[PDB]
């Protein structure tokens, strides 16, 4: 697996832009699936509750992000 899906269910990250984001080891956001649309994420893209995040990275770092964003 090189593409992982994380659900953004953490209120503390609502409206945060990717350009400010706390990247673990390092990850790329491949797509954000939001309200029937798949968006190509860039610096000014903001997270929203319920986003389906498609990410790529080493599993260790993906795991941290999954924990923080989906499991809190």
DSSP state letters, 33-53? EETTEEE---TT-B--TT-EE
Q: How far apart are CA 56 and CA 36, in angstroms?
A: 21
Nearer to ligand 2BA by Cβ, of 42 and 52: the residue is: 42
Work out which of 16, 56, 66, 68 binds its own copies, going by CB under 8 A: 56
Q: Can residue 32 be called a binding residue for its own copies (CB under 8 A)?
A: no
Question: Least Å distance between CB 17 and its own copies?
Answer: 15
Task: Find out whether 61 and 30 touch, Cβ atoms under 8 Å.
Answer: no
Question: Least Å distance between CB 57 and its own copies?
Answer: 5
């Amino acid at each position: 697996t090189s593409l992982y899906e994380i659900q953004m269910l953490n209120y503390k990250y609502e409206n945060i832009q990717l350009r400010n984001f706390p990247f673990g080891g390092d990850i790329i956001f491949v797509r954000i699936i939001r309200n029937n649309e798949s968006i190509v994420p860039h610096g000014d893209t903001q997270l929203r509750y319920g986003d389906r995040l498609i990410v790529t990275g080493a599993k260790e770092y993906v795991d941290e992000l999954k924990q923080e964003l989906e499991f809190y």
